[PDB]
Design a protein around this nucleic acid. Structure first.
Lengths: 96, 166, 374, 121, 38, 240
RNA sequence: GGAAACUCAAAGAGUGCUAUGCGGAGUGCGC
């Protein structure tokens, strides 16, 4: 790796890669803890009955031309993404 | 390694990203201390990335009290955890540049993944952004800073001295 | 002059677009002429968003003409050249330049967003999330940012986890605006009826009632009262009798007008325990914050609260035979309230009379009960 | 911090009262509240002494607002009759002021007292 | 499914802000530290 | 106390001479129809309907800046355009004159630590717009960094013996580059042991090691004993 | 011989002004 560095035209110099971390988005809780009073109240209400997408996997367990439309419009995000992946693999195994 | 800085204004808090690092050894040179007086070469250092104004003037007086006693208030907590990226375990601790070593440990306690720098370099580009000021925001605010700190100054003085109303 | 750098950045796409036979050089020099003028006006001094807008409009129009002459001359959908992605990627580059130079105007921000949504067939929410993040950081106070972001990633992605995250973030940044609290409750009941009818679908083919809306309503009322009382009395807490009492009753006035708005567009939701949740709303409005709105002052609010307490059970239809069965609670409440109120006795009597007049062989026993109410 | 804040303890009270007595015998002391504020805005006042048991307290508490404006030190003592006996006069004084004078024989004692009360505040 | 269609929806001002147009009109056209010169 | 006196512009802009038999020094009032301190006002009439505007006499025995002015300073930095950070603003003795020599456009951030002069200072400050009262200790400019922005001259009438650290911290935090520095030094309050220009030499050297280049000093001797007005500028880049 | 300008030419200084960098994915690694 020093022969391939002396055989290099330009060297933008911090060669060891800068370990920049995941940029701060507003889309995830950045401390994984209750921050305020409404956050802790909504989490203590949601902890007793919510999904780890178990019920989403159960409702995504599926097979008329409008019952499928109603189930798709009442699907969830991770269920829709996993079903898109499974249908993409199914279409790759089916078509050419 | 100064990646972000937090500037506290009368209208609200601002958080700037640092694009280019200022030079560390030649920081007492004429040609470096003049680029924080040139605006078109100070903006090659500092990009504005967030600005949360105070909702009410009562909250403006409250934040001024909390900064003067060095405490962290909730709007400051909001803007910090919006803007600052969460780091990994101990590698690449993210870095603020704040203006006082008393605000240091309090936001260190509120954010253990954040490191605070207040040295000559931090106060240098702090006073650069204080000098240029409202030209950084390019109108992205609701407030004029001199009249805003006029009202805030009379408020803070009155609340400090307990000036009577009757 | 970096305008020369952009102007000869755009040469290879028109080079390949000329050497395959869709334009000729005698008009690609014309579009190069107008592109030169646009780039100069763009990265000159004293420029403007309208210059960016006209550049976007011209480049979209030459993109559409490119596709038109592509399907006309070559009779194909695309020629897999460099141009086909290039022209919209430099449209996006213009958008990026305009947002960096002018992050003020939400009109240009919004049409950047709208173009990226319409490109969203091809392009990514990986790209969308970044521009929503930086727009959110540049405007924390503007509520339509959070609302449009939640509407997008709930009405395309339907990621309720991220929607709860950004609504909690928006209320964290400004717990002052009533609209964000209101539409947080709106999203809450939206997905709560969504998953109630989703488990109804599961029950067809093969707890989670409005306690979340109750909790966020309670913290909504507390935070909204705190922020109205801090919006008034600007710098100095005024200390007397009547202005203190007037500010507390003014906060209670505005807060309970807001809870009346919560009720009157809460009853749009029919697929949940609407009467039980409206009863919880009135039960939370019962005990007061240093004012005692029922027996003490705000008597007009006490009268409207009493009429809402009657009509929350009296919520019915023209086909009111079950109301003829269950109006004993209505008559009992009207009697127990007429036995309490003094001149609001007359007010509540006239109000229940007008509400029963809105409610009115099946009309015969209804005429009997109408004479009973009159 | 009630109202008459820099109240001297026993030893500093006694040394400022003995320097008051030798100043009064040297005719370098002007006594009483309104003669005190008169020499305060004349500008010849080295430091001022106020008895913090007066009837009531505000009659001399007007003096800090002038003296800390014009940058002279100010002490409270616990007793008007102690200050009267130390001024060498029959009635109880409540305020006393040392006129500045470079022809004094008490100058070093004045300055030592001033340094102690300025470190007190 | 009809109720799921008729569910109420979150309200912005954004795509109205990006789509709406401009319609309005245009209308046509001592110092404090200076002594009075005698 | 009722005679007629002519006005004339001084060398420094904003301040005026009032030449009569004796000749006063005077400034143009911000708040007409009032005297804050107890000074005499000279009222002139400008002749449009005619206006009546008044001028407050600046007392050099009661304000060290007016001592330095008519003792003769080559230049100030209190111009009628500038902004002025008044360290150690006790009362409306001098801050009123600095305020209305700045004028209606520019601000004087006056600071103060003690509470009784602070509350009469804010009661003064309600009557003229352009001054900002601060009731903080000057040793910690961090706890009022929220509310003063990039002042272009500092005046220092603080009288406690850590003056150099006071003016160094405040000038580093808020004084813009090539900006003015005006210091009043009181030898008996810095240290009474050694003599006056020895402590003036100490404080001048502490200034130029804090890279405030001193241009000028003045003893102001016919008005007050053992003070010195030191004017310097914040160099910050190329002290030499 | 003194004075009007949108009369022009030539220099200078100040204020500004930003002065301003194959693709959706999917597939295994990169903490």
């Amino acid at each position: 790796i020093v022969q391939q560095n002396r055989r290099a035209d330009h060297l933008i110099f911090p060669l060891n890669k800068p370990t920049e971390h995941n940029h701060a988005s507003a889309f995830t809780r950045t401390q994984d803890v209750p921050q305020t009073e409404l956050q802790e109240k909504v989490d203590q209400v949601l902890q007793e009955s919510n999904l780890a997408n178990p019920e989403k996997d159960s409702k995504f367990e599926e097979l008329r031309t409008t019952e499928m439309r109603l189930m798709r419009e009442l699907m969830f995000r991770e269920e829709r993404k996993a079903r898109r992946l499974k249908k993409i693999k199914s279409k790759t195994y089916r078509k050419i | 390694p100064i990646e972000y800085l937090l500037f506290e204004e009368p209208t609200g808090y601002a958080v700037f990203k640092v694009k280019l690092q200022q030079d560390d050894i030649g920081s007492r040179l004429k040609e470096v201390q003049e680029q924080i007086n040139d605006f078109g070469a100070f903006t090659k250092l500092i990009e504005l990335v967030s600005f949360a104004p105070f909702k009410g003037a009562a909250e403006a007086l409250e934040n001024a009290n909390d900064i003067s006693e060095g405490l962290v208030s909730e709007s400051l907590k909001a803007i910090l955890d919006l803007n600052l990226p969460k780091a990994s375990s101990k590698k690449k601790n993210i870095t603020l540049a704040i203006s006082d070593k008393n605000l240091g440990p309090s936001i260190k306690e509120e954010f253990p993944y954040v490191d605070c720098i207040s040295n000559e370099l931090a106060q240098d580009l702090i006073r650069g952004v204080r000098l240029h000021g409202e030209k950084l925001f390019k109108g992205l605010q609701s407030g004029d800073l001199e009249r805003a700190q006029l009202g805030l100054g009379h408020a803070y003085s009155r609340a400090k001295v307990k000036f009577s109303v009757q | 002059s970096k305008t020369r750098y952009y102007l000869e950045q755009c040469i290879p796409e028109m080079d390949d677009l000329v050497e395959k036979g869709l334009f000729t050089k005698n008009e690609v020099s014309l579009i190069m002429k107008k592109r030169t003028d646009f780039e100069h006006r763009l990265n000159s001094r004293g420029s403007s968003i309208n210059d960016y807008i006209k550049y976007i409009n011209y480049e979209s129009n030459v993109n559409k003409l490119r596709a038109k002459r592509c399907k006309r001359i070559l009779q194909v959908k695309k020629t897999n050249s460099l141009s086909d992605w290039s022209i919209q990627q430099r449209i996006g580059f213009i958008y990026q330049r305009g947002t960096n130079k002018f992050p003020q105007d939400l009109k240009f921000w919004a049409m950047y967003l709208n173009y990226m949504k319409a490109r969203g067939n091809q392009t990514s929410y990986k790209k969308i999330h970044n521009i929503y993040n930086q727009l959110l950081k540049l405007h924390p106070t503007n509520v339509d940012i959070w609302i449009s972001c939640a509407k997008y990633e709930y009405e395309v992605h339907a990621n309720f986890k991220s929607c709860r995250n950004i609504f909690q973030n928006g209320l964290r940044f400004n717990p002052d605006v009533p609209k964000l609290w209101y539409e947080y409750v709106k999203f809450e009941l939206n997905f709560i009826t969504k998953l109630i009818n989703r488990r109804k679908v599961m029950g067809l083919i093969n707890a989670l009632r409005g306690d979340i809306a109750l909790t966020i309503f309670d913290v909504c009322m507390k935070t909204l009262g705190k922020h109205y009382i801090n919006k008034h009395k600007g710098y100095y807490a005024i200390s007397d009798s009547k202005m203190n009492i007037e500010l507390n009753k003014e906060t209670l006035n505005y807060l309970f007008s807001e809870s009346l708005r919560y009720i009157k567009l809460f009853d749009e939701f029919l697929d949940l325990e609407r009467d039980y949740l409206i009863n919880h709303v009135l039960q939370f409005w019962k005990n007061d914050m240093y004012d005692l709105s029922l027996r003490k002052d705000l008597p007009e609010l006490y009268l409207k609260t009493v009429m809402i307490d009657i009509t929350l059970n009296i919520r019915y239809m023209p086909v009111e035979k079950l109301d003829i069965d269950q109006l004993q609670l209505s008559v009992k409440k009207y009697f127990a309230y007429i036995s309490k109120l003094d001149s609001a006795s007359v007010k509540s009597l006239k109000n229940e009379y007008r509400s029963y007049l809105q409610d009115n062989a099946e009309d015969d026993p209804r005429y009997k009960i109408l004479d009973l109410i009159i | 911090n009630p109202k008459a804040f820099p109240l001297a303890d026993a030893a500093l009270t006694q040394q400022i009262l003995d320097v008051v007595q030798q100043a009064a015998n040297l005719r370098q002391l002007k006594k009483g509240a309104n003669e005190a504020t008169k020499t305060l805005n004349r500008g010849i006042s080295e430091f001022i002494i106020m008895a913090a048991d007066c009837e009531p307290i505000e009659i001399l508490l007007h003096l800090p607002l002038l003296c800390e404006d014009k940058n002279v030190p100010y002490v409270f003592v616990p007793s008007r009759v102690a200050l009267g006996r130390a001024c060498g006069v029959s009635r109880p004084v409540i305020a006393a002021s040392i006129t500045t004078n470079d022809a004094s024989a008490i100058k070093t004692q004045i300055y030592a007292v001033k340094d102690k009360i300025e470190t007190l505040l | 499914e009809t109720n799921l269609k008729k569910l109420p929806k979150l309200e912005t001002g954004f795509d109205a802000l990006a789509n709406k147009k401009k319609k309005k009109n245009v209308l046509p056209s001592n110092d404090w530290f200076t002594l009075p010169k005698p | 106390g009722g005679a007629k006196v002519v006005i004339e512009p001084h060398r420094h802009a904003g301040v005026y001479i009032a030449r009569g038999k004796e000749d006063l020094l005077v400034t143009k009032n911000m708040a007409p129809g009032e005297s804050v301190y107890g000074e005499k006002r000279i009222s002139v009439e400008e002749p449009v309907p005619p206006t009546k505007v008044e001028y407050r006499v600046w007392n050099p025995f009661r304000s060290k800046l007016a001592a330095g002015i008519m003792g003769g300073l080559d230049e100030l930095f209190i111009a009628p355009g500038k902004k002025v950070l008044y360290l150690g603003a006790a009362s409306g003795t001098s801050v009123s004159h600095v305020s209305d020599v700045v004028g209606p456009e520019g601000v004087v951030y006056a600071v103060e630590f003690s509470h009784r002069p602070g509350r009469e200072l804010i009661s003064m400050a309600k009557k003229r717009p352009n001054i900002i009262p601060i009731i903080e200790d000057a040793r910690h400019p961090q706890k009022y960094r929220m509310l003063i922005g990039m002042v272009d001259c500092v005046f220092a009438d603080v009288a406690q013996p850590d003056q150099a650290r006071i003016i160094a911290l405040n000038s580093h935090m808020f004084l813009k580059d090539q900006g003015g520095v005006v210091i009043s030094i009181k030898a008996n309050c810095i240290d009474s042991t050694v003599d006056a220009e020895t402590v003036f030499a100490r404080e001048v050297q502490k200034l130029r090691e804090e890279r405030i280049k001193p241009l000028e000093q003045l003893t102001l001797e016919p008005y007050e004993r053992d003070h010195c007005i030191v004017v310097g500028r914040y160099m910050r880049s190329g002290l030499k």
